[PDB]
């Protein structure tokens, strides 16, 4: 679909599952040279790699924890070592867990902030460092959430991490725009993934979330991979520092449908 | 580029020049059927129509003033009469003129609000009316501007029209998302078009504008038509109620570059 | 409470009822010289004036339709004629009516846009014109709504009017900030007023709206008058171009409480 | 000025200097009981404490590093132990340092995120924990910045910390609004404080900053403490989850003045 993506090197953190996996497969289909990432489970990457082989794509799997500076540095270097360059950096790794704010431990708060936000900073910093030092107009895509805008009770750490990612991305975008380096966020709504498999398999919980989505359905990973592929391409040549929400309308305030209030 | 766009009927207001023209050609290239629009004489639309023919596209030009209800209604009916249906409605017609707010006439204010906002309303209304009465999962793309967010002294009417268009679009998107009818805005930054041809002709004014664009260059119409094609496609299937900015970073506050403030 | 408001001339459009009335009474209590406004019913102003007399305040009632340029011009002049000056201009007049967007007539759309948005522009233009021509650091407060941000199905015209008012205010604020003229919006959530009396008297409808308000209760006009009084005072000396939401949390997405989604 | 503030217990982090100091004095003037905070030595807090004594206010100074959980907990307990309760918790402590993003160390990034965001979290958490376990309708005011919205090259960590603070606050406000616990942010623009004393000392840098402020002048701490007093008062009873900007117009995009672009 996107011809300019051919031969482009794409690194995606936490890409052995969910959205990250869907993005690695989509990029492989666009003839991009993908670098899949797994925290510790090298077995999880096997599946994505097989899917990538199935479409005649090229990719390697690199172990790396986004909260570990050396792992992030090594992840970017691995891409350059294997493919000779880096074009797109996608900070997709993330985690969440429901706890009432006044009962949330520092440990829980720090883990989410560290992975979701600090992890994205490290990945962004490394990709941009390479782009600057070698005069490459590469791009950085950060996997945010509708929650960088929609507050999230029980998930204050996640909301904060994403709200912070928003400003980080915008700052990075304004800072490196003169060098032609684009930095954007993708803001997914509810998307059928492993972290949601059990919750959404239950008709009661599935219907509840669906009632919060104006378009009436829970998105598929393909719908988000489509956003990333487009944002990375030259089609989005004049697009930077934005958050492209792919959420079925969640950010439109579903409680206000039918003229309520 | 987008296979799903083939055979789709796209109506674009004020598409004889600038962004509208570019989108009309881009949709022609996507093998879609296009209904171009001109305000006064059909001579104005022949350039676009010849461009569409050149790429093997199918199209017609229909006269219409977007502030005239019957004209807007006729425009939608003409598409349906000529191509049998309607899939994408793009409210692109617009106008602006600088005047200090406290000295701005009601006449000037009204001309801008009527065309930019009310005009967009009528077009969205007619297209959505058709989509609902026929349960068609159509889409409405409204051409906004960075000024639906960035205030604009001397263009208080333009800014308010786009700010109003933002809420109109969000409302329409929430109201019709249950029917799969997506409504999105595109927010262009400074784009080289006939309305800027003279201003950007003076290298001193072009340089002033470029200094407000983080990416350092005034955009080209193709960079916007790229956004319109994607938004209309099924690639943006889960995207509704958003404003996708393509401004090379304008909304990022250019005056705060290099840690200023 | 606010000492600098003593002797300040405050004009409030549509102040014979609801929030406007509460603001006129509050300003009178702050020893401000208030100019109440009624569209045609001079009898409605009687009540506000009596309430103003009850607190030992000073005020006059002026007839004026905000969609009529001459009425607006005359309203501002009346303040200067009676009290010798103008310090604060509050564009509070407004209207709404529920109609599905694809079924909304141009007449309905125009009436709401004309009163809510164009009416605010005229009032803002006149107040600012006076402020500029006489070197006065006066202020303009525009009565917006949570709907300048929250989409509103069935009320597309209202949402659009308020979204437009947001950009108008911001533009006016940036434009006249060099002259020390502040322009801000107040964004009320659900507030017990005449337009809501019948709807909220019904326990079922009252409970529905209350379920959309995080703080659990429908606000009182006094809670909004408190916002206006503060914004007009020198306490808000460094505040301009903002929208101060007084909504019990509506803009925080009530559908997302308890970690839903 | 605000009668309801008399006898209220206000805790303010990093209140020995700047904005924190000003708010502490302002709350003293409002006849409230204040708990001032200093990081290293109590010598630093004596200026504030003497200022509070001067106006007849009651107060104590409590040592505490906001990134140390036990210190934050002790700070809340000390207020409750000294004045019997807690009514207002103000997370003011903050820090920043310029470094190009791609060259920013994890250490620098962490120091800023930990103090600005995590520190604010701990304070909000402890205050809210107390408010919930005692069903007290307390309030939390978090000191953000225009940079929770305005991107800031060279301060990617600061910007992300405030962006994260915005979502944290919104989440906390939605989560606890049912209990009448209001949580709001204050977004100061450029304010003359010790962190800017040296930079604004050079008339060339002061002029550069002033040129980015629509209102033309760098704010004073009192202009911010004014906002804090109001937000804490019952005058803002229906205000929660907002960020009240006091920046003389910075968020209005100063580069777009006079119709530029
Ligand atoms: N699934 C959704 O509906 C949804 C909605 C909005 C945003 N998101 C965001 O999209 C991204 C993808 O989410 P997902 O649904 O696929 O979730 P996921 O949990 O399936 O994917 C996240 C991946 O990150 C990996 N990971 C976590 N911590 C890591 C670390 N320290 N180092 C390396 N890898 C690490 C995990 O092992 C996992 O495979 C996340 O950032 C998430 O917050 C998802
Ligand atoms: N050019 C830019 O840099 C830029 C930046 C942001 C937004 N926009 C927006 O994009 C759209 C396209 O702008 P453009 O640059 O091509 O401007 P344009 O003026 O060249 O295009 C608008 C077209 O609308 C037509 N038109 C105006 N009023 C009309 C009416 N009442 N009925 C019918 N046709 C009418 C005009 O004749 C014109 O051809 C507009 O909505 C504009 O506000 C443009
Ligand atoms: N009541 C709420 O809950 C709420 C919430 C958000 C925003 N608002 C806004 O606050 C303002 C006050 O609303 P309210 O609840 O008091 O409603 P209201 O209808 O009681 O007050 C509006 C007043 O405007 C007057 N008016 C209408 N059109 C006019 C015109 N053309 N010329 C002169 N006067 C005119 C009306 O006669 C009326 O007294 C409105 O702008 C409204 O949109 C109200
Ligand atoms: N000064 C401005 O122009 C301005 C503009 C926007 C926002 N702000 C914000 O307002 C707040 C006040 O800023 P300020 O200008 O007075 O800055 P400041 O640095 O003078 O005040 C912050 C105080 O926090 C203390 N502090 C820092 N880290 C701490 C820690 N870990 N534990 C305890 N105390 C700690 C510092 O010693 C200092 O006295 C900050 O949150 C700042 O980011 C200030």
PDB file of N, CA and C in Angstrom, chain B residues 154-194:
ATOM      1  N   UNK B 154      -7.300  39.260  13.726  1.00  0.00           N
ATOM      2  CA  UNK B 154      -7.574  39.738  12.371  1.00  0.00           C
ATOM      3  C   UNK B 154      -8.488  38.773  11.624  1.00  0.00           C
ATOM      4  N   UNK B 155      -8.653  37.566  12.163  1.00  0.00           N
ATOM      5  CA  UNK B 155      -9.522  36.569  11.549  1.00  0.00           C
ATOM      6  C   UNK B 155     -10.403  35.939  12.632  1.00  0.00           C
ATOM      7  N   UNK B 156     -11.003  36.786  13.466  1.00  0.00           N
ATOM      8  CA  UNK B 156     -11.860  36.308  14.546  1.00  0.00           C
ATOM      9  C   UNK B 156     -13.033  35.500  13.993  1.00  0.00           C
ATOM     10  N   UNK B 157     -13.535  35.906  12.835  1.00  0.00           N
ATOM     11  CA  UNK B 157     -14.650  35.197  12.222  1.00  0.00           C
ATOM     12  C   UNK B 157     -14.208  33.836  11.698  1.00  0.00           C
ATOM     13  N   UNK B 158     -13.052  33.805  11.048  1.00  0.00           N
ATOM     14  CA  UNK B 158     -12.542  32.558  10.507  1.00  0.00           C
ATOM     15  C   UNK B 158     -12.294  31.570  11.640  1.00  0.00           C
ATOM     16  N   UNK B 159     -11.598  32.029  12.676  1.00  0.00           N
ATOM     17  CA  UNK B 159     -11.282  31.185  13.832  1.00  0.00           C
ATOM     18  C   UNK B 159     -12.551  30.620  14.488  1.00  0.00           C
ATOM     19  N   UNK B 160     -13.545  31.473  14.701  1.00  0.00           N
ATOM     20  CA  UNK B 160     -14.806  31.039  15.308  1.00  0.00           C
ATOM     21  C   UNK B 160     -15.550  30.047  14.408  1.00  0.00           C
ATOM     22  N   UNK B 161     -15.439  30.236  13.092  1.00  0.00           N
ATOM     23  CA  UNK B 161     -16.112  29.346  12.143  1.00  0.00           C
ATOM     24  C   UNK B 161     -15.524  27.945  12.208  1.00  0.00           C
ATOM     25  N   UNK B 162     -14.203  27.872  12.334  1.00  0.00           N
ATOM     26  CA  UNK B 162     -13.521  26.590  12.404  1.00  0.00           C
ATOM     27  C   UNK B 162     -13.679  25.971  13.791  1.00  0.00           C
ATOM     28  N   UNK B 163     -13.714  26.812  14.822  1.00  0.00           N
ATOM     29  CA  UNK B 163     -13.900  26.323  16.179  1.00  0.00           C
ATOM     30  C   UNK B 163     -15.295  25.722  16.250  1.00  0.00           C
ATOM     31  N   UNK B 164     -16.242  26.404  15.616  1.00  0.00           N
ATOM     32  CA  UNK B 164     -17.616  25.939  15.570  1.00  0.00           C
ATOM     33  C   UNK B 164     -17.714  24.668  14.743  1.00  0.00           C
ATOM     34  N   UNK B 165     -16.921  24.593  13.677  1.00  0.00           N
ATOM     35  CA  UNK B 165     -16.908  23.418  12.806  1.00  0.00           C
ATOM     36  C   UNK B 165     -16.388  22.196  13.558  1.00  0.00           C
ATOM     37  N   UNK B 166     -15.452  22.429  14.474  1.00  0.00           N
ATOM     38  CA  UNK B 166     -14.879  21.352  15.276  1.00  0.00           C
ATOM     39  C   UNK B 166     -15.985  20.707  16.113  1.00  0.00           C
ATOM     40  N   UNK B 167     -16.736  21.529  16.843  1.00  0.00           N
ATOM     41  CA  UNK B 167     -17.820  21.024  17.680  1.00  0.00           C
ATOM     42  C   UNK B 167     -18.959  20.437  16.869  1.00  0.00           C
ATOM     43  N   UNK B 168     -19.210  21.005  15.690  1.00  0.00           N
ATOM     44  CA  UNK B 168     -20.254  20.510  14.803  1.00  0.00           C
ATOM     45  C   UNK B 168     -19.881  19.077  14.428  1.00  0.00           C
ATOM     46  N   UNK B 169     -18.663  18.915  13.919  1.00  0.00           N
ATOM     47  CA  UNK B 169     -18.131  17.615  13.518  1.00  0.00           C
ATOM     48  C   UNK B 169     -18.147  16.586  14.653  1.00  0.00           C
ATOM     49  N   UNK B 170     -17.699  16.997  15.834  1.00  0.00           N
ATOM     50  CA  UNK B 170     -17.662  16.092  16.976  1.00  0.00           C
ATOM     51  C   UNK B 170     -19.067  15.650  17.339  1.00  0.00           C
ATOM     52  N   UNK B 171     -20.003  16.593  17.304  1.00  0.00           N
ATOM     53  CA  UNK B 171     -21.400  16.312  17.604  1.00  0.00           C
ATOM     54  C   UNK B 171     -21.953  15.330  16.576  1.00  0.00           C
ATOM     55  N   UNK B 172     -21.786  15.651  15.294  1.00  0.00           N
ATOM     56  CA  UNK B 172     -22.271  14.788  14.217  1.00  0.00           C
ATOM     57  C   UNK B 172     -21.676  13.384  14.317  1.00  0.00           C
ATOM     58  N   UNK B 173     -20.395  13.306  14.669  1.00  0.00           N
ATOM     59  CA  UNK B 173     -19.693  12.031  14.801  1.00  0.00           C
ATOM     60  C   UNK B 173     -20.242  11.195  15.955  1.00  0.00           C
ATOM     61  N   UNK B 174     -20.579  11.854  17.062  1.00  0.00           N
ATOM     62  CA  UNK B 174     -21.131  11.147  18.208  1.00  0.00           C
ATOM     63  C   UNK B 174     -22.559  10.717  17.883  1.00  0.00           C
ATOM     64  N   UNK B 175     -23.313  11.632  17.296  1.00  0.00           N
ATOM     65  CA  UNK B 175     -24.701  11.384  16.947  1.00  0.00           C
ATOM     66  C   UNK B 175     -24.899  10.260  15.936  1.00  0.00           C
ATOM     67  N   UNK B 176     -23.984  10.142  14.974  1.00  0.00           N
ATOM     68  CA  UNK B 176     -24.123   9.122  13.933  1.00  0.00           C
ATOM     69  C   UNK B 176     -23.151   7.965  13.922  1.00  0.00           C
ATOM     70  N   UNK B 177     -22.287   7.899  14.929  1.00  0.00           N
ATOM     71  CA  UNK B 177     -21.347   6.792  15.036  1.00  0.00           C
ATOM     72  C   UNK B 177     -22.087   5.445  15.166  1.00  0.00           C
ATOM     73  N   UNK B 178     -23.282   5.427  15.801  1.00  0.00           N
ATOM     74  CA  UNK B 178     -23.991   4.147  15.919  1.00  0.00           C
ATOM     75  C   UNK B 178     -24.353   3.560  14.558  1.00  0.00           C
ATOM     76  N   UNK B 179     -24.448   4.427  13.551  1.00  0.00           N
ATOM     77  CA  UNK B 179     -24.776   4.009  12.191  1.00  0.00           C
ATOM     78  C   UNK B 179     -23.541   3.859  11.303  1.00  0.00           C
ATOM     79  N   UNK B 180     -22.362   3.845  11.921  1.00  0.00           N
ATOM     80  CA  UNK B 180     -21.125   3.685  11.174  1.00  0.00           C
ATOM     81  C   UNK B 180     -20.769   4.847  10.262  1.00  0.00           C
ATOM     82  N   UNK B 181     -21.440   5.980  10.455  1.00  0.00           N
ATOM     83  CA  UNK B 181     -21.194   7.191   9.670  1.00  0.00           C
ATOM     84  C   UNK B 181     -20.105   8.004  10.369  1.00  0.00           C
ATOM     85  N   UNK B 182     -18.897   7.953   9.824  1.00  0.00           N
ATOM     86  CA  UNK B 182     -17.756   8.672  10.389  1.00  0.00           C
ATOM     87  C   UNK B 182     -17.708  10.121   9.920  1.00  0.00           C
ATOM     88  N   UNK B 183     -17.434  11.030  10.853  1.00  0.00           N
ATOM     89  CA  UNK B 183     -17.327  12.458  10.548  1.00  0.00           C
ATOM     90  C   UNK B 183     -16.018  12.945  11.169  1.00  0.00           C
ATOM     91  N   UNK B 184     -15.094  13.407  10.327  1.00  0.00           N
ATOM     92  CA  UNK B 184     -13.792  13.868  10.789  1.00  0.00           C
ATOM     93  C   UNK B 184     -13.404  15.203  10.166  1.00  0.00           C
ATOM     94  N   UNK B 185     -12.501  15.906  10.839  1.00  0.00           N
ATOM     95  CA  UNK B 185     -11.990  17.187  10.359  1.00  0.00           C
ATOM     96  C   UNK B 185     -10.534  17.012   9.949  1.00  0.00           C
ATOM     97  N   UNK B 186     -10.086  17.869   9.041  1.00  0.00           N
ATOM     98  CA  UNK B 186      -8.692  17.892   8.614  1.00  0.00           C
ATOM     99  C   UNK B 186      -8.272  19.327   8.941  1.00  0.00           C
ATOM    100  N   UNK B 187      -7.165  19.474   9.660  1.00  0.00           N
ATOM    101  CA  UNK B 187      -6.696  20.796  10.026  1.00  0.00           C
ATOM    102  C   UNK B 187      -5.400  21.176   9.335  1.00  0.00           C
ATOM    103  N   UNK B 188      -5.465  21.762   8.127  1.00  0.00           N
ATOM    104  CA  UNK B 188      -4.244  22.152   7.413  1.00  0.00           C
ATOM    105  C   UNK B 188      -3.558  23.347   8.061  1.00  0.00           C
ATOM    106  N   UNK B 189      -2.236  23.399   7.922  1.00  0.00           N
ATOM    107  CA  UNK B 189      -1.468  24.520   8.420  1.00  0.00           C
ATOM    108  C   UNK B 189      -1.357  25.446   7.220  1.00  0.00           C
ATOM    109  N   UNK B 190      -0.189  26.049   7.003  1.00  0.00           N
ATOM    110  CA  UNK B 190       0.001  26.930   5.848  1.00  0.00           C
ATOM    111  C   UNK B 190       0.284  26.072   4.612  1.00  0.00           C
ATOM    112  N   UNK B 191      -0.627  26.125   3.642  1.00  0.00           N
ATOM    113  CA  UNK B 191      -0.502  25.337   2.413  1.00  0.00           C
ATOM    114  C   UNK B 191      -0.486  26.241   1.181  1.00  0.00           C
ATOM    115  N   UNK B 192       0.481  26.026   0.290  1.00  0.00           N
ATOM    116  CA  UNK B 192       0.594  26.815  -0.944  1.00  0.00           C
ATOM    117  C   UNK B 192      -0.630  26.603  -1.824  1.00  0.00           C
ATOM    118  N   UNK B 193      -1.479  27.618  -1.864  1.00  0.00           N
ATOM    119  CA  UNK B 193      -2.714  27.593  -2.632  1.00  0.00           C
ATOM    120  C   UNK B 193      -2.936  29.004  -3.190  1.00  0.00           C
ATOM    121  N   UNK B 194      -3.905  29.175  -4.111  1.00  0.00           N
ATOM    122  CA  UNK B 194      -4.183  30.493  -4.697  1.00  0.00           C
ATOM    123  C   UNK B 194      -4.485  31.617  -3.704  1.00  0.00           C
TER     124      UNK B 194
END
